């Protein structure tokens, strides 16, 4: 009885098992933009992904990772409010079932259909597993997706889709460049919270761009036809592994521009 995103085992669920659920600094949280304060002391996010090496992409029941080489500075996020180098590890999206709902984070209660998510550690820890045990061990880079025109730099990715279908599946997933995920602009909002899932750990920087990518429709609907459950079990369509919005608390988002 693992934690999911199906009827039983739900966001609403892992505080019983991930008590820090109920913490002080938890993700995905509503962005207000008329709260946020621009602060004039942010960076130009620095992205630099020339040199990334992707090597394979994962259905690991919950979502598809796509993997990175981190095992040097190859894609790395810096600058933006960030103190050091983060390395890219890997993205993955969480989406809906419907185009109304599937982002985690929402800009003033607005939903967006998907959520883009950079996972990037700092190089200041040695390695992911180290980095999240500190409050700044990571930075993730939210993009939002609404569906409209077609991403060309996500093709890549929807077209494998098929060879992961169910939990536990990879696939050689060689030359992506995380560079055709990007919008035009870097702007973003950014502050202190958690990773979305479980161990719900409190040791992420979020960066959350304004712009959102578009995507097709056709290309989000490959994304539903992924499955949670593994081979030759009864299909559960891997659609709504988004976690909504948790209580600000004693926190302030703050804004690159504005
Ligand atoms: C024992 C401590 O380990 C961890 O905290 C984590 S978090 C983590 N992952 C990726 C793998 C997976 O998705 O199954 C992860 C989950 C959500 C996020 S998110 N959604 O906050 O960006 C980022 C990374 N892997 C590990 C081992
Ligand atoms: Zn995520």
Same mark, same amino acid.
């Given at each position: 009885?693992?934690?999911?995103?199906?009827?039983?085992?739900?966001?609403?669920?892992?505080?019983?098992?991930?008590?820090?659920?109920?913490? *002080?600094?938890?993700?995905?949280?509503?962005?207000?933009?008329?709260?946020?304060?621009?602060?004039?002391? =942010?960076?130009? $996010?620095?992205?630099?992904?020339?040199?990334?090496?992707?090597?394979?992409? =994962?259905?690991?029941?919950?979502?598809? #990772?796509? *993997?990175?080489?981190?095992?040097?500075?190859?894609?790395?996020?810096?600058?933006?409010? +960030?103190?050091?180098?983060?390395?890219?590890?890997?993205?993955?999206?969480?989406?809906?079932?419907?185009?109304?709902?599937?982002?985690?984070?929402?800009?003033?209660?607005?939903?967006?259909?998907? *959520?883009?998510?950079?996972?990037?550690? #700092?190089?200041?820890?040695?390695?992911?597993?180290?980095? !999240?045990?500190?409050?700044?061990? +990571?930075?993730?880079?939210?993009?939002?997706?609404? &569906?409209?025109?077609?991403?060309?730099? $996500?093709?890549? &990715?929807?077209? !494998? =889709?098929?060879?992961?279908?169910? %939990?536990?599946?990879?696939?050689?997933?060689?030359?992506?460049?995380?560079?055709?995920?990007?919008? *035009?602009?870097?702007?973003?909002?950014?502050?202190?919270?958690? =990773?979305?899932?479980?161990?719900?750990?409190?040791?992420?920087?979020?960066? !959350?761009?304004?712009?959102?990518?578009?995507?097709?429709?056709?290309? &989000?609907? %490959?994304?539903?036809?992924? #499955?949670? #459950?593994?081979?030759?079990?009864?299909?559960? $369509?891997?659609?709504?592994?988004?976690?909504?919005?948790?209580?600000?608390?004693?926190?302030?988002?703050?804004?690159?521009?504005?």
């Amino acid at each position: 009885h693992h934690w999911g995103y199906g009827k039983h085992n739900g966001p609403e669920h892992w505080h019983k098992d991930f008590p820090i659920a109920k913490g *002080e600094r938890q993700s995905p949280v509503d962005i207000d933009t008329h709260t946020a304060k621009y602060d004039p002391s =942010l960076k130009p $996010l620095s992205v630099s992904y020339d040199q990334a090496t992707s090597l394979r992409i =994962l259905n690991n029941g919950h979502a598809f #990772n796509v *993997e990175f080489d981190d095992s040097q500075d190859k894609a790395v996020l810096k600058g933006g409010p +960030l103190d050091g180098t983060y390395r890219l590890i890997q993205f993955h999206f969480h989406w809906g079932s419907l185009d109304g709902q599937g982002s985690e984070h929402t800009v003033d209660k607005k939903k967006y259909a998907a *959520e883009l998510h950079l996972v990037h550690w #700092n190089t200041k820890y040695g390695d992911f597993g180290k980095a !999240v045990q500190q409050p700044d061990g +990571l930075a993730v880079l939210g993009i939002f997706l609404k &569906v409209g025109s077609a991403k060309p730099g $996500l093709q890549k &990715v929807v077209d !494998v =889709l098929d060879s992961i279908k169910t %939990k536990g599946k990879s696939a050689d997933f060689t030359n992506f460049d995380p560079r055709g995920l990007l919008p *035009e602009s870097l702007d973003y909002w950014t502050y202190p919270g958690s =990773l979305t899932t479980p161990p719900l750990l409190e040791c992420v920087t979020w960066i !959350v761009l304004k712009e959102p990518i578009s995507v097709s429709s056709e290309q &989000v609907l %490959k994304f539903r036809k992924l #499955n949670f #459950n593994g081979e030759g079990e009864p299909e559960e $369509l891997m659609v709504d592994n988004w976690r909504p919005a948790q209580p600000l608390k004693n926190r302030q988002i703050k804004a690159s521009f504005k």
